[PDB]
From a paper:
Each subunit consists of a predominantly β-stranded extracellular domain and an α-helical transmembrane pore, which interact via an extended interface. Whereas ELIC forms a cation-selective channel with high conductance that is activated with high efficacy by the primary amines cysteamine, propylamine, and GABA, the cation-selective GLIC is activated by protons and inhibited by bulky positively charged compounds that also act as open channel blockers of the nAChR.
In ELIC, the mutation P254G has a small but significant effect on the structure, which overall shows the frequently observed nonconducting conformation. The reorganization of the well-structured M2-M3 loop indicates a change in the conformational properties of this region. In ELIC, the mutant P254G shows agonist-induced currents with a similar EC50 as WT but with a slower activation and an unusually slow deactivation of the channel upon washout of the ligand. This behavior can be observed in two-electrode voltage clamp recordings, where the activity of the protein after a change to ligand-free solution decays slowly, and it becomes even more pronounced in macroscopic recordings of excised outside-out patches. The cause for this unusual deactivation phenotype was revealed in the structure of the P254G mutant of ELIC. In this structure, electron density between Arg255 on the M2-M3 loop and Glu155 located in the β8-β9 loop of the extracellular domain of an adjacent subunit indicates the formation of a strong ionic interaction that is absent in WT and that may stabilize the open conformation of the pore. In the background of the mutation R255A, the kinetics of channel deactivation of the P254G mutant becomes similar to WT, thus confirming the role of the interaction for the unusual functional behavior. Whereas the predominantly local effects of most mutations, which modulate the open to closed equilibrium of the channel, resembles the behavior of eukaryotic receptors, the mutation of a conserved proline (Pro254) to glycine in ELIC resulted in the formation of novel interactions between residues apart from the site of mutation that were not present in WT, causing an unusual functional phenotype that would have been difficult to explain in the absence of structure.
Author numbering:
A (entry chain A), B (entry chain E), C (entry chain D), D (entry chain C), E (entry chain B): 11 to 317
The structure:
């Protein structure tokens, strides 16, 4: 079994696609193994780049194809090199930008955490083994984080493993295990923006919706609530047009629904206080009670959301 | 006729385009047939990848071109391999990401069901037969379903068939039948998001619009209804800007129209009760009747929507 | 002059770009002519695909370049084959997806009609003639039409002609005429969606805008009209954000302008009735007259729109 | 110096990008020069297309590379031919679609005028001269203009000139001047759509905003003005979501700002009339004066906008 | 060590991607070094373009690969030439369009400043040195600046340095330092558009929001504030749909938050004055005091924002 050691340099992780559960990775990938010794110009290692790389393969050079398992579409490979050492070593180095998929959960949206993963396997060889995997996620850890959108919690974890494929031919007795490198990078989203520009104004709106009870007339209380209803819809839209459409409701989307509920419950209470008492009494003990109880019931129900 | 057996591995189905009736499919495709025996290095099967694959075809190797019938534009083929066995077997393995089209019906939008299909035929050969089709849709079936946007009901169905092309040349007496593999995967949309963030708020709005009759004055009743009218339009827009523009009205689009109708019918009733009775009587038996009857008539018409 | 007969199979026409006046066409293109007889393996016609096609051209095989005149950018050609017959026939078959342009008029938007055209010419040869053009637009004609966005009125019409290019070199005495195939497919847009989700609610809004006269006070009439004005703007936006921005006003855009006019004319009449009569008389004979005349004047002006 | 004559056929100019100051040009490009005489099949001119063009360059044929100076990214070249004449003439013909940049000013937005320019230079040769430039902008000039988005005022102007590059090597004594063809096509935007769907409704709204003074109470006048304030914001948005974001304010963008100013100035006057006079007099001579003067001051300031 | 001198011509910098922190650069890149002397046709320098460049590399010509370190994906290379001098000089000239990344701060949005950087390194050689870097940012400096979106303060700065890579093989004793060219261009955003179309109208709205205190009744004061609240939401959306979603709050985003606060603070004060005084006194000394103090407190807090 050929011993192949890879090294992965990560420059930039960006472009998270929430609907497709994908993200972009730009960086370099190096792989090194030892083969037959070779006659090289002089005795220095030979450097072969780009189009000339295919030429050595035509003359018989073995360069195994390594596939990104979780890549979504063929990645963009920039420059690529072959390092031919006289003692048999071979080092392949290539710059790449690719889009990768992983199971990503966004239910706890502004405060969510994710891990960007890479999965690397040889495309056709099981009789060749990934020897050791060193990844260098050299991006700032303490420089610009409150400024950046994602916070990388710690240096990446590596794990080389063996994957068992069952459905093969009928001629393979036992060589159906492939070497797989699995890289994991944990990251947490920066909630700062969504707090100030989304959650807070919605709170102010939802809070101000409770001040509908401080109106004196019943007509004032019911009519105004319809203008409040419109405000939530308009704010529900402002949110959606910028955030997007996930398959599941988010925290902000739950707050949006809560705004709808608070206002509709106020409409019911406002109508209730009018026609609840016999002979046209306006039940002022309710309008004044829920004048502060309606804010409190919303805070009490909100704490069970974190159950 | 050459016996060709294919295997299709499906990694990911995503990116449904409702207007174009298309969807993205990432996976692998394997095809195996038996040809002339061959001298191989030693006696082990030879592996040929990527650029070297074309070289064997230049020297005379027969590799038939298989086309995805329902593909929309050339698919992205990642790595591809040739497995050359000494006893004559040939295994072609290729990673692909492609967009496929199918007749897709979206009238019952949030609750619609679809099937993603793949259609594979030899491009030029009818004297070559697809022998058996095994597809492995190994994606979760009981892991993350309430979390994902689509729910795969069951394992995919396969069907090898014969397609008759009429309009050919004039030299083909009887060889105008091509082997076609047709794969079908059934899936149902996860309605969770559209229920909570779209259908529910619209219900709350449509319901609250009926509380206009609980206003005491006629001026109050008619003026407020115009604010309700604006609210539906604003909600119609919140919906449309996020969902899109389908060629046919959806379930949600019908509810929006129902909202418009309920409000416009309320405007008619509110004006009617005012000027229906002689000498300016306000017909209070109407405003109080439809105070609860207007909610009931909407529920009665909604049940005939499912007729 | 070489006799070349072409066949065009049309699988799918989609993605109309209203601003760029373009549309997408997926299908196949076949071309057949008779050349020198040839020695083939055995005596059966030889099949040459994809990369192997260029090789025969290197060894001298004449394969003319046919250009889509109205194509917008190089189209995406999938698989391509050459059928080499021993008696001299040559059949070129290629799958393609391309974007084509034509003069498209959208002034009668929801009810507009269009024709999708294809124009095919030899790129460099005038001494070679397109012999006959058979196109197979085998898409449903009576299956799913009320469901699809476009309705194909009938099977495609074809027209082979000769195009005279003037500005050529100085050495061409008379060979400046090229053979051109022109395929035309007429289609009418399905107005269902735009009627129910756009035209109807606008009518309801415009109609309800006339109910401003059923208010009793002048203050009510003028103040409410400002909320109606806002409602049209909000609806004008809902329309535009989903449809788009054409270079010319559409039917829907004219109705929107009619909404602006109806409301603005109501403001004038509402203000007129107040200060028209001497000593502050409110001219109640006007508010009651245009209470129904304003709906009628809009219906009368709408009929002259179809003049 | 080699004498090269070019001809540029322009089929379609579309896709203006206001922010990037670019536009799309589809057409053909022809170049002709006279070189060494040549032995050709028979004695007829030889036609070489697409992949075969590169082959003649390998055997030594001189085909100069012509670059579009103001192109943004490599253009999409469709079919290309070589016409090899026996007397030494060589004609290169290629279809192309490319994006070109020019300084484009949009300050007078609906009524702006632009010129789409093409700049063509040899990439590496200064000892080779562009002999004459004929461009054929055969697009309708009197057919569909009120229907199309841009109006071409007249046939294009051509200009071959000499460009002096300074910063070269140290070995070039006098050969640092390159031949440049400069084609200019003047075009004016079709304002019809923006007048009817943008400028006119804004005028109606801005006009109707002045009718706030026809309200009798002070409370009516100030409260309504806030609804007018909201209406302008909604209309400012309807405009922007369809037009876009230019680096400078447009004519329409100025009208929007004028709407904001008129309403805010109205708020000031409405509040002014209330508390300007001692002992609570409402200064009715102001409300009735600016009832018509406020429309007049807006027209007077609007005329100085064209100073 | 080989002496390589580069020259970079920058034609156009556009397409700032605020979320991805990237920008597009179109221009040329030239590199010159001296190698072995060579026999050339006649004795003039030989010009090799495009496809022919690869051919000399096959026969042994050394052309090092230079990588853009901060490029995001492989850039679009237009025409490229090789200048082969007989005395050993070699000049490589290539047109390119690429997207580059740099750390970009947008916190002070309309008034922010940025620098567009290029980073150029040899891909595989450390025993080869970038000799001198001349970049020609010949774009207007005093022509169109108030018209363009960005203002380039001055000509670009250059910086050749040495980059030390640690994690290399085990056979490199001391050759782990690579030459890096770093070009920097400073630019300031044109705030004109954002001042007139965003900052000014928001100021008027926030200012006009303070005129709610000039209403006489308490019912008037609270009801109108809900219409003001909606106005901020509508304007918050107008802003966002055109600007986008940055990871951090901007100056404009802060003003939006200030608008919500002023209105929400107004709601509290309006309700306070009603129920603050015993026996139902309306505390008119408060409504008139903050009639001007509320504008002043907003101006007083706004100056501490620039702290």
């Amino acid at each position: 079994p050929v011993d192949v050691s890879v090294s992965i340099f990560i420059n930039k992780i960006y472009g998270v696609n929430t609907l497709e559960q994908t993200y972009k990775v730009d960086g370099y990938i190096v792989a090194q193994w030892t083969g037959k010794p070779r006659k090289t110009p002089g005795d220095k290692p030979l450097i072969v780049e780009n189009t000339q790389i295919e030429r050595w393969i035509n003359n018989g050079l073995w360069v195994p194809a390594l596939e990104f398992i979780n890549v979504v579409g063929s990645p963009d490979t920039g420059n690529k090199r072959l390092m031919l050492f006289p003692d048999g070593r071979v080092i392949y180095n290539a710059r790449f930008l690719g889009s990768f998929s992983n199971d990503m959960d966004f239910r706890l949206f502004p405060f969510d955490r994710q891990q960007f993963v890479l999965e690397l396997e040889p495309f056709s060889y099981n009789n060749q083994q990934l020897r050791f995997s060193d990844i260098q996620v050299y991006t700032e850890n303490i420089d610009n984080e409150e400024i950046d959108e994602w916070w990388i919690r710690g240096k990446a974890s590596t794990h080389i493993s063996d994957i068992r494929y069952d459905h093969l031919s009928s001629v393979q007795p036992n060589q159906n295990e492939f070497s797989r490198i699995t890289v994991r990078i944990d990251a947490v989203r920066n909630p700062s923006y969504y707090l100030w520009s989304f959650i807070l104004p919605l709170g102010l709106i939802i809070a101000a919706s409770w001040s509908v009870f401080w109106l004196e007339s019943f007509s004032e209380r019911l009519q105004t609530s319809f203008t409040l209803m419109l405000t939530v819809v308009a704010y529900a839209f402002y949110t959606s047009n910028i955030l997007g459409r996930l398959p599941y409701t988010t925290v902000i989307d739950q707050m949006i629904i809560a705004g709808y509920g608070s206002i509709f419950a106020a409409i019911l209470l406002i109508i209730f206080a009018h026609h609840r008492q016999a002979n046209g009494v306006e039940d002022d003990l309710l309008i004044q009670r829920c004048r502060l109880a309606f804010p409190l019931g919303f805070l009490a129900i909100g704490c069970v959301l974190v159950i």
